[PDB]
Amino acid sequence: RPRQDPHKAGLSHYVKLFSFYAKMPMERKALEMVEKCLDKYFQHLCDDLEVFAAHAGRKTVKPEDLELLMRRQGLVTDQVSLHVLVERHLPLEYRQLLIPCAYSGNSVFPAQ
Amino acid sequence: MALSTIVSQRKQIKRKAPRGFLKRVFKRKKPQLRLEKSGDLLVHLNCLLFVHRLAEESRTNACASKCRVINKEHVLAAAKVILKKSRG
Amino acid sequence: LEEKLLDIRKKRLQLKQASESKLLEIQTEKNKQKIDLDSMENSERIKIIRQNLQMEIKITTVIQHVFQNLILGSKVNWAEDPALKEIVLQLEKNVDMM
Amino acid sequence: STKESKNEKLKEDLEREQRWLDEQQQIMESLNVLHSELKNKSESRIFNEL
Amino acid sequence: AEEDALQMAVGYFEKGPIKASQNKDKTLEKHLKTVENVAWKNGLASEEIDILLNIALSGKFGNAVNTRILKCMIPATVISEDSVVKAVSWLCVGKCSGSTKVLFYRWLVAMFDFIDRKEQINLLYGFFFASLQDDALCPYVCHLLYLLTKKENVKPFRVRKLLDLQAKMGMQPHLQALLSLYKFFAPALISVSLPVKKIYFKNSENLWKTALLAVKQRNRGSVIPVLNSSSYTKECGKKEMSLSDCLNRSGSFPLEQLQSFPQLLQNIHCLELPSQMGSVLNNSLLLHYINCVRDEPVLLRFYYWLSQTLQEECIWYKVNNYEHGKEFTNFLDTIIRAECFLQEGFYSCEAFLYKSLPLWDGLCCRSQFLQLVSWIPFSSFSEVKPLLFDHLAQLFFTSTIYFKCSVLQSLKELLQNWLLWLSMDIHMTTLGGSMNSVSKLIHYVGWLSTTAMRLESNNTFLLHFILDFYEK
């Protein structure tokens, strides 16, 4: 008779992925405070997205706002673009929606 | 294996992202906004690189103290450096 | 029972004796046929032509696999066109067997 | 009792040896045909196929 | 009747859907129900198989509809090979959604045997390989690629792709199975050690499993080394391909393909030998090959392996191991059954008897040890007397009556074997010399028998065996 908090369902995905990268046995008490770290990151992440959108004069959040954030984070540099990072870390089905490629009569999707 | 300590995951779960979860969490915190249809995926990418950073820093602290099991004081120390670095 | 067994065993041993010599002569004939062909080692033409084989095969292999992936990525129905259809079937086949 | 045991083993050996003889006859016929076929069956010609 | 209703439904699908006709949806339901009833009752003929699959993957009928045709698809007759080729081409278009794509691969794996010809399927290995990229279809494509894989399909660049997928997803069980199959075909490229056999591909009950029962009714109505291909140090560092290979001349028969006697009959003259020659011991088809070879390197390899193994496994000799007990008996039984065929004894066994006979107590492995004695090659009696019979006689006179009967049995069998081998030679040491040895053996056993009768006080149980010898 299981009952699961929907909020904990989302965090459980990244918590398991954490144990894959660690490559060390990890104590149970370390698990839940990583969950504590994640929600703090999400809260502060959303706050930053407000200002960058607000500065541009549009309330809607567009991808180039996310590019601007990651450049300040140091993830995106002159050599490593946004397209390069998607290729390395995301599956094929997610790649089609994000990165545009021309095919079948020079048709490009998404339009860029 | 004891309940208290969890062994490293040999096989990663399917790389499918929880798109529904990201939309609601972004919705409740800032209801007034609307996010573009593909913006959820990029947020998922941003979260991966954060967790990847957190795992590397925690491992170094555990090895520095000559500990074979990652402990809570190791990861909290990792959190302080990464969280400030993660904000830009 | 013993009277039957003796005859069976005798016939089996005769068969073994005959088969051994027959197979030995076949093996030695086949081995003789192989060795002399290898030792031709003509220098005026053979090494000249063989190196051409080493290069034309490699180029044809690359074109085969490049053409295969372009068809997949173009997202077209190749089976509908008979002219393109028979090209697709030939791509996987090795050029060495040719 | 010993004689009964001997007879049982003799019958089993008989059937097994019969099977072996059948297989070996087949192999002998195959070898004969193959040797006959091979018996029934240079730089200039070699350079041609290349 | 029913056929006419089935025909109208088939043509109805080919016509295409109508947006404004809600009634035809009910007409669709009864038409689609009729196909289901025909499929469950008897299935569908080959001609209409090619029809609906093109329609099902076409995607004008929607995911909700197209899903349930695949479930009810039943091969009453053999599936045409050209039908599958058209179906794969429609997947390249990509109109069908994820649910349709998953169902197609599950169906084809289940229905793999029913395709009449698999030659043109193997020519589409490249297209199935590309689907490994998408995570949704990965477990099912791995199962399909497991069956189609042959030696030509494994290529070095495809080897790199599989390793790259393993870094991203980790230790996926369905990838470990596929990688092992790749290592077997090309051991010079990959090295995998796998822990131990669990079922890698989940044997979940497929949707058509119950229907297959109806279709099946219609159709119905280690001490010894393991077998492995010849060691891959063959060729190894080679400057260039041989001229014979360049001209595609002959070759050898791979060991994995040899699985039936008719296959052995065709290719007896050219065969691939195992990496370790002790594996021939329990393989019946290779025993027929070594029955008539008499080649020297193979004899030496077998000699060294068997002599070392016997020395290490024996019970009263070389560190006196008693733990093996039953294992040694089973090994000896296998050896005896192997040399009853081939109608001769191994050279290793003779050396083992000559070395270990002095230390034997006469009871440990009586049956097998005494059955090894019968297969001693013909030789002059004076030479082998000090080696064998001096120990056998000393063990004979001081033992129980059952040991005496056992040795009389073994000597009778030895005499029969010697006579059998001598008779064929005269059809082909001189003959006068040869008869002297057998006469000396007969006189020796007569001396044994007379003294044994004196020691045992005229027991009739022994006299039966003594007369059994002279019957032969």
CB atoms within 10 A of CB C19: 20
Cβ-defined contact of B15 to E171 (cutoff 8 Å): no
- Closest partner CB to E269 (pick from D24, D34, D46): D34
What does the alpha-carbon distance between residue A67 and residue A102 come to, in Å, rounded to a whole number? Answer: 23
Q: E109-147 in b/e burial notation, b at 16+ Cβ within 10 A?
A: bbbeebbeeeeebeebbbbbbbbbeebbbbbbbbbbbbe
Helix, coil or strand: residue E334: helix
CA distance D40 to chain E (A): 17
Tokens of A15: 């918590």
Query: Quick one: C2 exposed, middle or buried, by C-beta within 10 A (0-12, 13-18, 19+)?
Result: exposed
What does the alpha-carbon distance between residue B59 and residue B56 come to, in Å, rounded to a whole number? Answer: 5
Please, after which residues is chain D broken with C–N above 2.5 Å?
41
The answer to whether E284 and E241 have CB atoms below 8 angstroms apart is: no
Find chain B residues with C-beta within 8 A of E171's C-beta: 10-11
Tokens of C8: 């069976």
Query: Quick one: E386 exposed, middle or buried, by C-beta within 10 A (0-12, 13-18, 19+)?
Result: exposed
Tokens of E429: 């040491």
Find chain E residues with C-beta within 8 A of B17's C-beta: none
* Cis peptide bond N-terminal to E173, omega within 30: no
What does the alpha-carbon distance between residue E127 and residue E121 come to, in Å, rounded to a whole number? Answer: 11
Q: What is E256-267 written as a DSSP string?
A: TT--SHHHHHHT
Cβ-defined contact of E288 to D49 (cutoff 8 Å): no
E231: DSSP letter? P
The answer to whether B17 and E178 have CB atoms below 8 angstroms apart is: no
Q: Which of residues 298-357 of E touch D (CB under 8 A)?
A: 341
Q: Do the two chains B and C touch, given a threshold of 8 Å on CB pairs and at least 3 pairs?
A: no
What does the alpha-carbon distance between residue E348 and residue E85 come to, in Å, rounded to a whole number? Answer: 58
CA distance A88 to chain E (A): 10
- The reported resolution of this PDB entry, expressed in Å, is 12.0
Start-to-end CA distance of chain C, whole Å, equals 60
Q: Which of residues 66-105 of A touch B (CB under 8 A)?
A: 66, 69-75, 85-86, 89-91, 94, 97-98
Cβ-defined contact of D35 to C18 (cutoff 8 Å): no
CB atoms within 10 A of CB E298: 15
- Measured N-to-C along each axis, helices E431-456 and E390-397 cross at an angle, to the nearest 10 degrees, of 20
- Closest partner CB to E243 (pick from C38, C72, C79): C38
Cβ-defined contact of D23 to E261 (cutoff 8 Å): yes
Helix, strand, coil percentages for chain C (3-state, nearest 5): 80, 0, 20
Helix, coil or strand: residue E236: coil
Query: Quick one: E237 exposed, middle or buried, by C-beta within 10 A (0-12, 13-18, 19+)?
Result: exposed
- Measured N-to-C along each axis, helices E401-427 and E390-397 cross at an angle, to the nearest 10 degrees, of 150
Contacts of residue C31, defined as CB under 8 A and 6 or more positions apart, other chains included, come to none
- Closest partner CB to D30 (pick from E268, E291, E341): E268
What does the alpha-carbon distance between residue C18 and residue C29 come to, in Å, rounded to a whole number? Answer: 17
Cβ-defined contact of E134 to A20 (cutoff 8 Å): no
Find chain A residues with C-beta within 8 A of C74's C-beta: 103-104
What does the alpha-carbon distance between residue E343 and residue C13 come to, in Å, rounded to a whole number? Answer: 7
What does the alpha-carbon distance between residue E418 and residue E344 come to, in Å, rounded to a whole number? Answer: 10
Helix, coil or strand: residue E469: helix
The length of chain E in residues reads: 472
The answer to whether D49 and E244 have CB atoms below 8 angstroms apart is: no
Residues of A with CB under 8 A from a CB of E: 20, 91-93
Which residue type, as a one-letter code, is found at position E64? A
Find chain B residues with C-beta within 8 A of A91's C-beta: 15-16
Which residue type, as a one-letter code, is found at position A53? A
What does the alpha-carbon distance between residue C53 and residue C31 come to, in Å, rounded to a whole number? Answer: 27
Q: Do the two chains A and C touch, given a threshold of 8 Å on CB pairs and at least 3 pairs?
A: yes
Q: Do the two chains D and A touch, given a threshold of 8 Å on CB pairs and at least 3 pairs?
A: no
What does the alpha-carbon distance between residue C57 and residue E246 come to, in Å, rounded to a whole number? Answer: 12
Start-to-end CA distance of chain E, whole Å, equals 80
What does the alpha-carbon distance between residue E149 and residue E239 come to, in Å, rounded to a whole number? Answer: 29
What does the alpha-carbon distance between residue E362 and residue B12 come to, in Å, rounded to a whole number? Answer: 63
What does the alpha-carbon distance between residue E386 and residue A74 come to, in Å, rounded to a whole number? Answer: 91
Q: Is C77 part of the contact surface with chain A (CB cutoff 8 Å)?
A: no
The answer to whether E374 and E417 have CB atoms below 8 angstroms apart is: yes
Contacts of residue E77, defined as CB under 8 A and 6 or more positions apart, other chains included, come to E43, E44, E45, E46, E49
What does the alpha-carbon distance between residue D23 and residue E292 come to, in Å, rounded to a whole number? Answer: 14
What does the alpha-carbon distance between residue B12 and residue A89 come to, in Å, rounded to a whole number? Answer: 13
Handedness of CA D10, D13, D18, D19 (dihedral sign): positive
Query: Quick one: E58 exposed, middle or buried, by C-beta within 10 A (0-12, 13-18, 19+)?
Result: middle
Test the E interface: residue of A16, A20, A93 with most E CBs within 10 Å: A93
Tokens of A68: 């601007």
Chain A adjacent subunits, 3+ CB pairs under 8 A: B, C, E
What does the alpha-carbon distance between residue C61 and residue C69 come to, in Å, rounded to a whole number? Answer: 13
Handedness of CA E35, E37, E38, E42 (dihedral sign): positive
The H or E element that residue D8 is part of is helix D2-40
As beta bridge partners, residue B77 has none
As beta bridge partners, residue E115 has E79
Q: Where are the domains of chain B?
A: 19-86
Nearest CA in chain E to D29: E265
User: Thinking of the domain B19-86, which architecture would CATH place it in?
Assistant: Orthogonal Bundle (1.10)
What are phi and psi for residue E293, nearest 5 degrees? -130, -55
